[PDB]
Amino acid sequence: GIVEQCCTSICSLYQLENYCN
Amino acid sequence: GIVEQCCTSICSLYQLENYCN
Amino acid sequence: GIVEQCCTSICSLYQLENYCN
Amino acid sequence: GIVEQCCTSICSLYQLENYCN
Amino acid sequence: GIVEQCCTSICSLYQLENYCN
Amino acid sequence: GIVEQCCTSICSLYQLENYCN
Amino acid sequence: FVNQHLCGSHLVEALYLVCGERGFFYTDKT
Amino acid sequence: FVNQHLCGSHLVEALYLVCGERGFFYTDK
Amino acid sequence: FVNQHLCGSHLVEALYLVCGERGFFYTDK
Amino acid sequence: FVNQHLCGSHLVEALYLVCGERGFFYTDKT
Amino acid sequence: FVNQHLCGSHLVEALYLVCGERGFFYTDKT
Amino acid sequence: FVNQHLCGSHLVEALYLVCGERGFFYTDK
Ligand SMILES: Cc1cccc(O)c1
Ligand SMILES: Cc1cccc(O)c1
Ligand SMILES: Cc1cccc(O)c1
Ligand SMILES: Cc1cccc(O)c1
Ligand SMILES: Cc1cccc(O)c1
Ligand SMILES: Cc1cccc(O)c1
Ligand SMILES: [Cl-]
Ligand SMILES: [Cl-]
Ligand SMILES: [Zn+2]
Ligand SMILES: [Zn+2]
């Protein structure tokens, strides 16, 4: 999810916007 | 909403918890 | 102390209030 | 500068990026 | 106190250090 | 650099000021 | 718990801490 | 469980900035 | 010594929120 | 992206996130 | 060091950084 | 790559406080 994807490696703001709304 | 309750006014802990899932 | 207790595992706000004052 | 653009006024993302290297 | 010195007015580093143990 | 020096071990504010400007 | 205006990032951090494993929903402005 | 917990503190602050007025959900499992 | 140092940054921000006007001490050893 | 005044530490955090591997320069006041 | 109002969480973060291994005491309001 | 990324979030907030009006650069490589 966001934690598996963005805590192992860096999520850019572009990656992170996927999780908006 | 949370912004209007806890940012423009001050919320209690209990009030803040209404925005938990 | 707080660091041994709350850096290894998660302290909730309830756990953390123990360290107030 | 960044402070006068984005703190005293509001900056867009694009505006914020002018301060990247 | 710290709030009245450094939040309502501005504190120096030296002033901030008065609240170290 | 700052990351090798200050992420492995703690940089104090004194250490960190080296990286100002 | 604080008696403070909590806004922007501080509001989210507070929800994060308060809600624990439940997680939360942030609407921003309604 | 801190490293993931500490990571999530940053993630929520990042999502706040990126999503802005759209907002977001933060939950799993 | 960062991971504990970085952890303590979050802990102090958390204690600020939870203790509010009671305040707190942050020290050991 | 937020439509907000971003000041002090929040401004730097925003630049940090926005700029990624490029990094950034923070002048503070000019 | 900054010439800024430091309040709420920012004040605590500043004390945390400034005080190092000594640690600190936060009264909030007196 | 998070631990260094998460570390850098704190470093930039620390440099903000310590450098104040002098400011700073944040980049390498
Ligand atoms: C901005 C950010 C915070 C935490 C983890 C990430 O991958 C990205
Ligand atoms: C809120 C919080 C921060 C850091 C560690 C913890 O266990 C809990
Ligand atoms: C203040 C600070 C933040 C992050 C790493 C450090 O070594 C020091
Ligand atoms: C990833 C995750 C698990 C459990 C609760 C949460 O808020 C987030
Ligand atoms: C240390 C480092 C590497 C690459 C980009 C940065 O902003 C910082
Ligand atoms: C846990 C710990 C050790 C040393 C100094 C501190 O402020 C906190
Ligand atoms: Cl603020
Ligand atoms: Cl961290
Ligand atoms: Zn703030
Ligand atoms: Zn962190």
UniProtKB/Swiss-Prot annotation, chains A, B, C, D, E, F:
Disulphide-bridged cysteine pairs: 6-11
Parts forming coiled coils: none
* Name used for this protein in its record: Insulin A chain
Q: Which residues of the full protein are shown?
A: 90 to 110 of 110
